[PDB]
Amino acid sequence: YQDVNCTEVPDQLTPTWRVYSTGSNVFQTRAGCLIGAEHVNNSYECDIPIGAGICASYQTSQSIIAYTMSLGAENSVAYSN
Amino acid sequence: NSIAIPTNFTISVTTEILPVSMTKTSVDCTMYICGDSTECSNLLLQYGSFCTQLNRALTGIAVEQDKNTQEVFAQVKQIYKTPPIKDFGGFNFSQILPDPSKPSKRSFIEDLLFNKVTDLICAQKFNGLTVLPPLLTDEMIAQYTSALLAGTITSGWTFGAGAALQIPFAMQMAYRFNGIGVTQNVLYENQKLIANQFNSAIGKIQDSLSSTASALGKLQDVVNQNAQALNTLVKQLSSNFGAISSVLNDILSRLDPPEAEVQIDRLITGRLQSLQTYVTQQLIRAAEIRASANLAATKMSECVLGQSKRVDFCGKGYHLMSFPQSAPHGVVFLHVTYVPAQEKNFTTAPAICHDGKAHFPREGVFVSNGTHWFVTQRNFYEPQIITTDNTFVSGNCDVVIGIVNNTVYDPLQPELDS
Amino acid sequence: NGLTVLPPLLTDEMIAQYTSALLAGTITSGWTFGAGAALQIPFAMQMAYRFNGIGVTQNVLYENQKLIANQFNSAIGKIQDSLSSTASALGKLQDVVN
Amino acid sequence: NSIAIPTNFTISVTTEILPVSMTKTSVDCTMYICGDSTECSNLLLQYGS
Amino acid sequence: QSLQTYVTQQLIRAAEIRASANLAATKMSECVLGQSKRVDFCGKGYHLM
Ligand SMILES: *[C@@H]1O[C@H](CO)[C@@H](O)[C@H](O)[C@H]1NC(C)=O
Ligand SMILES: *[C@@H]1O[C@H](CO)[C@@H](O)[C@H](O)[C@H]1NC(C)=O
Ligand SMILES: *[C@@H]1O[C@H](CO)[C@@H](O)[C@H](O)[C@H]1NC(C)=O
């Protein structure tokens, strides 16, 4: 639900969509309220771009996960003089 | 037979601002053409599939807008962090590397750009006009353009062509002089002056951006244009297009369907034309932005990830290096360039004749102070002695025009004598 | 019918004052007038610093100077006779107007 | 093990033509859509911007 | 509608001219204000001036 603070996702029009209007998977981003995805603490190069740095993809007995997209690995070149 | 050889240089920093993307808009065709009026939705339904074409176009646009920023910035396959060091041969990089003090990784020049580039928007929201946020936030851009700036400093032209290899900063600037003609001994004997000129140039740039009549007018022209076209798209809901009135509820509450329809249709044909015009303007302007975001990618790939030999491409003068900085919907380039100064007239000669055979320079020109003849590199006055080491003999001195009688000193014979 | 054609900001007599200052710098200064203060250099002695950029050494030029001059001049003459011919190659410019 | 080395050169002048600009046109919308007709100017006025 | 079509054609053709007037600027900046090493850019053959 784009640019909708999560409180407003109702009313109870059809329960098959009310399932996607509530639950524990309700997640908030800077692009709106995303429902039906699990918010993980990993980081990946992202497959389906939600927006504002959040991306979602399908994986593990599997489900849709919405993570924060990863730019890449770290490195620190040993710069001496 | 008169040449002019520079004797003192000047390292100058320019600036260049390039648009990269623009706001990702999206209009809800039904909600705009006739919104909240079920009595008009059916009428519009039969009018064709314009409602979905004018949403697929604005989706393609908002997708390439996300792709342009990937193209321009995401050119490093890793994320380098500059080591906590200051031993940059005297060069000062405070004004461009990210600071620890500020909570974000914004450098002292990237913030001068954010605080320089600058109801109705709610009304657009009520009319189905949405502005989506970009995929790459303004805190992730700063984590690329600070990994594109800690690789150039500590690795050079190598981090963009394989595994990054460290190299002392001084000893890489001297391998950038050696790419534009001036030999290395020029750098290693003028190191302090070069550092104290580069630092001053950076300071003057920082004071230049903060001035009024800002050169970043290119970046705030994009926003002005894309916020002016969309305001006309809302101004044009006040025109009735020759119908009874411009409010759809008025027409619905003054006329029965047999006569209401023949007026709604001269509304539905008036708003859809405006929407199509807006979509076409967006398509053309997005083509311009696409053109100008594949030149920024090229300048980032060449002026930054290496050194350029294309004249007047990476800033006026001989190009030494560059530094990228982020900016709202744009990229800023700080081309650091080498500029000669203080020319000085000299008398030259094509080729020199020692024993009838004509000696020629290997790298440089022949220059005389009026009495003695030397051979010098061409972008700096560094006279040497005309030896059989740096002149290659070729032919007989009767064919070249301008040959000068002189003497060439061989290093072998005098030292060998004992 | 309200269809107006405005005149350009730069007249066709000011264009000729740029493309004759872009052509008296190349001849007498070379690659330097576009990268700082222009520095003079004898014309021959700059063509030999343009041979030395494409591989051929300078002694090639300084020992073939007359032939090079008498070939460049002939090339210019043939170009002048080529433009004056029909089926002009400037069809790109008169396509815009058409 | 066979190479081919040129022995005599040829200096050639080409030509290249590039468009730079085009005629700067401008149309007066009212004067064209319905000109010299005050009875139509009002009608066109309400038609939008 | 005719006027809008004409304006759109002008916009597109002006985009073409803009594209072809930033290649002429590049060729003037490189082929003239220096020497080029890009093959078959400043005319066929090794480019002198
Ligand atoms: C969203 O709703 C919560 C719950 O009322 C509120 O605390 C928060 O301030 C709201 N934020 C926005 C951006 O509307
Ligand atoms: C993920 O990070 C948030 C932010 O601190 C934290 O509250 C949460 O417990 C973390 N969850 C996991 C599974 O690491
Ligand atoms: C240069 O020009 C002067 C003009 O009098 C002439 O005397 C001299 O021989 C010329 N030298 C060369 C090398 O062209």
Numbering used by the authors:
A (entry chain A): 612 to 621, 627 to 676, 689 to 709
B (entry chain B): 710 to 827, 848 to 1147
C (entry chain D): 856 to 953
D (entry chain D): 710 to 758
E (entry chain D): 1002 to 1050
Pull text from the paper.
To explore the mechanism of ATRA-mediated inhibition of the spike-ACE2 interaction, we incubated the purified SARS-CoV-2 spike with 40 μM ATRA or dimethyl sulfoxide (DMSO) as a vehicle control at room temperature for 30 min, identical to the treatment in ELISA, and prepared cryo-electron microscopy (cryo-EM) grids. In contrast, for the spike-ATRA complex, ~66% of the particles were in the RBD “all-down” closed conformation, whereas only ~23% particles were in the open conformation. The cryo-EM structure of the RBD “all-down” (closed) spike-ATRA complex was determined to a resolution of 3.45 Å with C3 symmetry imposed. The final refined structure of spike-ATRA was a symmetric homotrimer, of which the receptor ACE2 binding region was partially buried at the contact interface with a neighboring “down” RBD and not fully accessible. Additional elongated densities that did not belong to the polypeptide chain could be found near the contact interfaces among the “down” RBDs on top of the trimeric spike protein, which had one distal end embedded in a hydrophobic pocket in one RBD and the other distal end exposed outside the pocket and in contact with a neighboring RBD. These densities could only be observed in the closed spike-ATRA C3 map but not in the closed spike-DMSO C3 map, which was also determined to a resolution of 3.51 Å in this study. ATRA could be well fitted to this elongated density, with its cyclohexane head in the pocket and its carboxyl group at the distal tail exposed. The cyclohexane head of ATRA in the hydrophobic pocket was surrounded by the side chains of a series of phenylalanines and tyrosines, including Phe338, Phe342, Phe374, Phe377, Phe392, and Phe515 and Tyr365 and Tyr369. Arg408 and Gln409 from a neighboring RBD form a fork firmly holding the carboxyl tail of the bound ATRA through salt bridges and hydrogen bonds, which hinder the movement of the RBD and lock the RBDs in an all “down” conformation, thus preventing their interaction with ACE2. Distances between the gravity centers of the “down” RBDs in the ATRA-S complex were 31.9 Å, which was much shorter than the distances (34.4 Å) measured between the “down” RBDs in the DMSO-treated-spike’s structure, suggesting that the bound ATRA significantly enhanced the interactions between the “down” RBDs.
The entry of SARS-CoV-2 into host cells is mediated by the virus-encoded glycoprotein spike, which forms trimer spikes on the surface of the virus. The receptor binding domains (RBDs) of the S trimer adapt “up” and “down” two distinct conformations, of which only the “up” RBDs bind the human host receptor protein hACE2 (10–12). Mechanistically, ATRA directly binds in a deep hydrophobic pocket of the receptor binding domain (RBD) located on the top of the SARS-CoV-2 spike protein (S) trimer. The bound ATRA mediates strong interactions between the “down” RBDs and locks most of the S trimers in an RBD “all-down” and ACE2-inaccessible inhibitory conformation.
